[PDB]
Design a protein around this nucleic acid. Structure first.
Ligand SMILES: [Mg+2]
Ligand SMILES: [Mg+2]
Lengths: 280, 166, 148, 59, 106, 140, 103, 78
RNA sequence: GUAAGUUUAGAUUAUAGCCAAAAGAGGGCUCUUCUGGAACGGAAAAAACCUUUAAUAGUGAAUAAUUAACAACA
């Protein structure tokens, strides 16, 4: 037995580390932990984004219906929901997002510009964006971690509160910065699901009064082996429109259809980069 | 010395909710000080891994090693307590999940040699551990087919990237 | 040590610089002792520099807690969920002031080996090289020595 | 360009078949051409860990 | 673009890492002034060795200022020992390329 | 035993944490792990310098492949571009060949033409007009 | 026909100098494949899996033993047999669970 | 041994440089007599600087401020 | 052209070298005398030959040394 307590003190810390790894603690919401002031946190939220909010409106957005039920049940043993703001905020975003897309890609079909808007207002994108902006920390609800449908609702309510305070032009910049950015590096059909691409291509060519394409084999390698490469090119009026690679002729031919469609709708990889330069 | 295998039988879970699979039962049993080498006991404990209770008891009854008889008696007690104390319905519905051997506390003695020399002798001891899990034995292993092998190979080729470039 | 440690690729939290730049640091906590030689330098920092730092950075909430203490400590938390902790035992005002500024500039991403300096999501404008680029075609698509 | 991710990767790393005629040629000079293509040193995407070789047929 | 002491192939939205301090605040916009080549799908322009200021303008933003991970330096010496060791950490900065613009003044 | 060292536990863990990914008794026995870790650190330091040289060889190998597709040897391609006052380095040239095939071909023709102009100037002797691409801009 | 490289495979190169002589301008449009240089698709007789099954035909002994099966696999993919054997538990437990992904 | 081509050329290039060194050393601007005394003033000043530094060593001042500042180690908030 | 040198006070360790290149002396050794060396690059591996002013980070650049050389008549 050595004299001294400092080595014993240090070892207690390591025993704490070992216990945590083996038995990870259940998650807790930050409000419970020390160093929390609700009023101060809300104000910093607005200033962080370089946007001005009205305190009364912004606080209402975070409140959720499920939270009210829990408090009353505890109370037996006033508030005001964000339902109004949620409906208004979501509606404008759908219209605003559609307006952005149509100008950028006028030719692209209507059904397409609905999938992309649905893609960018889904739980996956909204929940991912919401957490990194601290929306989850400030939410008031009866369950933690907050369920995704609840988290999504509070996000759009905040945009609604921003719309009322600072008007349409400011909110349009908000949607561009945080939602439109999420489509960087994303190929079209990754966000829109189209089966039988050739069938869609035939109809589109008819509208512009173009002849149906003729499939032909431009390049070939290792056909008889188990790793073959095929290049199939769609020829129109003896003029090439698209070329696609694939493992099999059917796969390669289907690939050529997608290449053709992308050019028609102007969603190619080398298209003009989006524009965030405008300060207005 | 550590005795943790014994205490494993006293865990209590909260009642299961109606919409949930029925949780199978578990039994832990051991015999501690045995006059047998742990290296030799390993071969016996290894053989009965994964088998059902009846198949295990059948193979043990016709083995000539001294360890085979000791393992069999431990298995019989585990079966008895499973029905009597752990709410197992059918005796036959059990299989061996875990079985292994461990070192015990040993003794040192003298071994004589032929010129006034000597050596150090060890009288060796071992432990035996088992866990019994209710239910039929899980299905055995199936080797990869030729088609399964190929599908992995294409996956490897598809994963390639252009290395050390933009 | 590289083979003994993890690595990652260069990235940003939420495309920080595309539309608008957002500061990742959001909270600071500093604990002190009223009368303890170890925490003297931290006390002077509160006397002089704490208020000015708060104004220049308005998106960070700062908490100052005097209490009986043995080591003054600073905790920094970020939007992506990272937490960092630093001891300030017996340091000067200048040391603490410079330390705080480093925390402000950082994003919570882990400090480990970065595989490449440059990251692009649109590496090619004219099309990526494949073996058939730079190979001339042939009439009727006849592979070599095929009679037709 | 504008291909999907998987077809793009498949096309770039595909392996090619070549033909050489050896009549009246010196064996050493034939080897230099064959070794170049077998290793894959004819591709700007060559790396020692990428297995980018091609097939060579000599008659 | 030639920046620091290195040449970088660049495009909009790209991320660049510079291994030294720059003296620029975070969130600040900058103009890169040494450009050697600008290219598009159908045409390219080459300087000899640099393009004129009128033709091309490239702008970037400062996103993060950080330090590198610890690097171990241990010289080879008889009686090496495990404590005859140094840790090197360098300051770093990250830039995001924003835009590339050209004008019809050829 | 008036004074005894009470910190030996943490001094041991400093070495052993760097040896967990080894194989054998080298990852748990201090007298063996300590010898292996210092050998690793020496290798790590010497490989920082060797890395830069290795990457340059990779660039030169890939450039030769790209140029030969257009019929040019590596020395001719690199040298003639310099005589045209083009100061692109080897690292960026590899990027263009892989990711900008059309731009790389344009550079291939430029280097070839400058080479031809040099050949004509060499064979022809006396005062003759210099090549269009063989004119050097001057600075002061 | 000023370009010194043939224009028939990748692109057409047109190189010019500006009047001041400080910039070099490059025009490189793409070349499309002529129709006369293509072949018709063989519509009369395809998923890559079907190709593999025909290649890896199980004919004798039902599922073959390790060795004979590996020799069949090596011929199809033009490798040696050593590639196909498994490894021990030491190597399998070192493998990373979640390797990084670039884009 | 046989001397490689590289080695023969590299040596020649170094020979040519030294030949030019011989030429440029053959045309002195000033004769020996003209040189005498032309730089005496500068040289004498230089040694005076060297001597002054040598004979300037002495201990350093000590201040009450340094000693009494140690008491601030126990400063506090009252 | 250049920055050292003398005096005063204090203090140990060391007192067997090795190879290359010159000049001698006893006849391959053995002594005496003048010059140089101790790579992480090169000569196949490579203490002693050749290139090389210290030591740091970088996915920049120009160079140094660099085992090879091109059977008759006339
Ligand atoms: Mg023994
Ligand atoms: Mg080098």
């Amino acid at each position: 037995v050595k004299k001294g307590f400092r080595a014993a003190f240090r070892f207690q810390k390591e025993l704490e580390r070992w216990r945590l790894l083996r038995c990870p603690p259940p998650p807790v919401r930050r409000s419970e932990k020390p160093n929390w002031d609700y009023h101060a946190e809300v104000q910093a939220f607005g200033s962080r984004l370089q946007e001005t909010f009205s305190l009364d409106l912004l606080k209402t957005a975070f409140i959720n219906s499920c939270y009210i039920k829990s408090e009353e049940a505890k109370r037996q043993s006033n508030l005001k929901d964000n339902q109004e703001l949620f409906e208004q905020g979501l509606s404008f975003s759908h219209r605003c997002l559609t307006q952005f897309l149509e100008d950028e890609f006028p030719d692209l079909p209507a059904e397409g510009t609905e999938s992309l808007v649905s893609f960018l207002t889904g739980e996956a994108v909204v929940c991912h964006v919401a957490r990194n902006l601290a929306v989850e920390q400030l939410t008031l609800s009866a369950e933690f971690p907050v369920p995704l449908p609840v988290l999504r609702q509070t996000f759009f309510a905040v945009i609604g509160a921003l719309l009322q305070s600072s008007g349409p032009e400011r909110a349009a910049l908000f949607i561009r910065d945080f939602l439109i950015t999420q489509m960087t590096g994303k190929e079209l059909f990754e966000m829109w699901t189209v089966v039988n691409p050739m069938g869609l291509l035939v109809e589109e060519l008819k509208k512009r009064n173009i002849s149906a394409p003729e499939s032909r084999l431009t390049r070939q390698s290792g056909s008889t082996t188990a790793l073959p490469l095929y290049f199939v090119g769609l020829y129109c009026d003896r003029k090439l429109i698209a070329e696609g690679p694939g493992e099999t002729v059917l796969v390669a031919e289907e690939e050529a259809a997608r290449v053709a469609l992308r050019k028609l709708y102007g969603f190619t990889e080398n298209r003009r980069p989006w524009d965030y330069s405008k300060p207005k | 010395i550590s005795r943790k295998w014994e205490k494993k039988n006293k865990i209590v879970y909260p009642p299961q909710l109606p919409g949930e699979p029925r949780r199978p039962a578990e039994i832990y049993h051991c015999r501690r000080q045995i006059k047998y080498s742990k290296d030799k006991m390993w071969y016996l404990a290894k053989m009965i891994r994964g088998m059902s209770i009846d198949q295990a008891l059948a193979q043990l009854e016709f083995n000539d090693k001294k360890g085979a008889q000791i393992i069999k008696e431990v298995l019989l007690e585990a079966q008895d307590m499973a029905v009597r104390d752990h709410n197992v319905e059918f005796r036959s519905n059990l299989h061996i999940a875990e079985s292994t051997s461990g070192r015990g506390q040993c003794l040192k003695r003298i071994r004589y040699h032929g010129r006034g020399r000597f050596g150090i002798m060890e009288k060796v001891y071992c432990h035996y551990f088992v866990k019994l899990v209710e239910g039929p034995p899980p299905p055995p292993e199936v080797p990869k087919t030729a088609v399964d092998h190929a599908k992995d190979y294409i996956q490897q080729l598809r994963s390639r990237t252009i290395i050390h470039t933009l | 040590t590289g083979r003994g440690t993890s690595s990652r690729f260069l990235t940003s939290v939420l495309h920080n610089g595309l539309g608008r730049y957002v500061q990742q640091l959001q909270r600071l906590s500093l604990s002190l002792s009223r009368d303890a030689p170890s925490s003297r330098g931290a006390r002077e920092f509160v006397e002089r520099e704490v208020t000015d730092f708060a104004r220049r950075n308005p998106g960070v909430v700062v908490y100052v807690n005097p209490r009986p203490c043995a080591m003054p400590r600073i905790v920094a938390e970020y939007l992506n969920g990272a937490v960092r902790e630093e001891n300030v035992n017996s340091k000067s005002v200048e040391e603490i002031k410079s330390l705080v500024q480093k925390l402000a500039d950082q994003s919570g991403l882990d400090v480990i080996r970065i595989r490449k300096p440059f990251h692009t999501d649109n590496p090619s404008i004219q099309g990526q090289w494949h073996p058939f680029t730079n190979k001339r075609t042939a009439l009727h698509g006849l592979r070599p020595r095929e009679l037709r | 360009s504008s291909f999907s991710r998987a077809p793009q990767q498949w096309a770039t790393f595909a392996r090619m078949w070549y033909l050489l005629d050896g009549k009246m040629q010196p064996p050493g000079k034939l080897a230099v051409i064959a070794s170049n293509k077998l290793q894959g040193l004819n591709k700007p995407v060559y790396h020692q860990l990428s297995d980018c070789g091609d097939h060579v047929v000599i008659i | 673009v030639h920046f620091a002491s290195h040449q970088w192939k660049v495009t909009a939205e790209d991320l660049i890492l510079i291994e030294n301090e720059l003296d620029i605040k975070c969130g600040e916009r900058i103009r890169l002034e040494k450009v050697l080549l600008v290219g598009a799908d159908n045409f390219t322009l080459l300087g000899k060795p640099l393009l004129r200021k009128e033709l091309v303008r490239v702008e970037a933003t400062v996103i993060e200022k950080t330090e590198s991970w610890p690097k171990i330096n241990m010289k080879f010496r008889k009686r090496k020992n495990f404590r005859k060791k140094k840790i090197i950490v360098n300051p770093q900065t990250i830039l995001r390329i924003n835009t590339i613009e050209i004008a019809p003044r050829l | 035993l008036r004074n005894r060292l009470t910190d030996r536990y943490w001094r041991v863990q400093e070495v052993l944490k760097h040896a967990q990914h080894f194989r054998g008794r080298k990852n748990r026995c201090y007298r063996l792990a300590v010898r292996a870790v210092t050998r690793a650190f020496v290798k790590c330091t010497k490989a920082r310098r060797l890395k830069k040289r290795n990457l340059r060889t990779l660039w030169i190998n890939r450039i030769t492949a790209a140029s030969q597709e257009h019929g040019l040897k590596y020395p001719a391609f690199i040298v003639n571009l310099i005589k045209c006052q083009v100061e692109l380095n080897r690292k960026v040239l590899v990027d263009l060949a892989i990711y900008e095939p059309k731009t790389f071909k344009s550079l291939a023709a430029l280097a070839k033409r400058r080479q031809q102009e040099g050949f004509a100037a060499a064979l022809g002797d006396g005062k003759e007009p210099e090549g269009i691409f063989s004119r050097v801009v001057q600075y002061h | 026909t000023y370009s010194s490289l043939p224009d028939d495979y990748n692109c057409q190169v047109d190189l010019a100098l500006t009047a001041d002589g400080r910039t070099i301008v490059c025009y490189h449009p793409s070349v499309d494949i002529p129709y006369e240089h293509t072949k018709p698709i063989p519509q009369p007789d395809e998923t890559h899996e079907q190709i593999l099954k025909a290649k890896l035909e199980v004919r004798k002994s039902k599922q073959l033993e390790q060795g004979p099966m590996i020799e069949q696999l090596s011929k199809v993919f033009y490798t040696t047999k050593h590639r196909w054997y498994p490894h021990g538990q030491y190597h399998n437990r070192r493998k990373k669970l979640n390797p990084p992904r670039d884009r | 041994r046989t001397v490689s081509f590289q080695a023969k050329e590299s040596m020649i290039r170094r020979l040519e440089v030294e030949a030019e060194n011989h030429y440029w050393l053959s045309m002195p601007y000033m004769t020996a007599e003209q040189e005498c005394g032309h730089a005496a003033e500068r040289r004498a000043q230089a040694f005076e600087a060297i001597k002054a530094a040598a004979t300037s060593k002495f201990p350093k001042h000590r201040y009450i401020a340094d000693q009494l500042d140690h008491l601030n180690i126990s400063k506090k908030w009252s």
